[PDB]
Design a protein around this ligand. Structure first.
Ligand SMILES: [Zn+2]
Ligand SMILES: [Zn+2]
Length: 219
């Protein structure tokens, strides 16, 4: 039960991908994706690392590199997205999640984000980061994050990588809605050039298409 260390790798100008891991009953060591988005000296975090140590590591690197850290958002409630919220709260770094995500954190006796994003859409950092509820999928609360300056959509675990043979854990999934929700995102972000899933390799808008088809067959 050793697990690698976090890493952080430039995706393109001002966008870094953070990868970290956890060991999971009946599945093993599992990688997990998140971002650091930069705009003119400012950093915002999309999803936390899957542990405090990795969260700490990630923050230190943001500070070391001189960025002002405006906060983090989580894209659904499960630990792989939110584990670091508590540590972040205690170090007075602002945490965000939607209403529906915060409800499920509390309702599952987890530390809630400090601030709450209301409605289906919200913006963060002067329009640099948009948050959108495409509808039910992986979970009832899942949101995507769109980065218009970069033409990047961070799908979170709402989007499956191309080599996924299925939808992953569907205990809390809305399988029959997922296909429509995926289509909602496809219509809305036809401009998207890079799409980043919650687990696995990044690609283009093809990931949203594959995810859509997976939802169709899972029905
Ligand atoms: Zn999940
Ligand atoms: Zn996930």
């Amino acid at each position: 039960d050793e697990v690698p260390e976090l890493r952080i790798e430039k995706v393109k100008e001002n966008i870094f991908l953070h990868t970290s891991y956890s060991r999971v009953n009946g599945f093993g060591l599992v990688s997990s994706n998140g971002l650091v988005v930069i705009d003119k000296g400012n950093a915002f975090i999309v999803d936390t690392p899957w542990s405090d140590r990795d969260t700490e590591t990630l923050v230190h690197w943001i500070r070391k590199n001189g960025y002002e850290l405006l906060g983090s958002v989580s894209t659904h409630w499960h630990e792989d997205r939110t584990a670091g919220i508590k540590w972040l709260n205690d170090q007075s770094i602002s945490t965000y999640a939607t209403t529906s995500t915060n409800h499920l954190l509390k309702e599952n006796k987890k530390e809630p984000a400090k601030y709450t994003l209301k409605g289906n859409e919200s913006t963060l950092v002067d329009g640099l980061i948009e948050v959108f509820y495409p509808g039910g999928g992986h979970t009832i609360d899942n949101v995507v994050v769109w980065l218009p300056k970069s033409k990047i959509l961070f799908g979170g675990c709402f989007v499956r990588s191309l080599d996924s043979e299925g939808l992953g854990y569907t205990g809390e999934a809305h399988i029959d809605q997922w296909s429509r929700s995926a289509q909602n995102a496809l219509s809305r972000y036809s401009e998207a050039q890079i799409v980043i899933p919650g687990h696995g390799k990044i690609g283009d808008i093809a990931l949203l298409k594959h995810t859509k088809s997976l939802a169709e067959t899972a029905s």
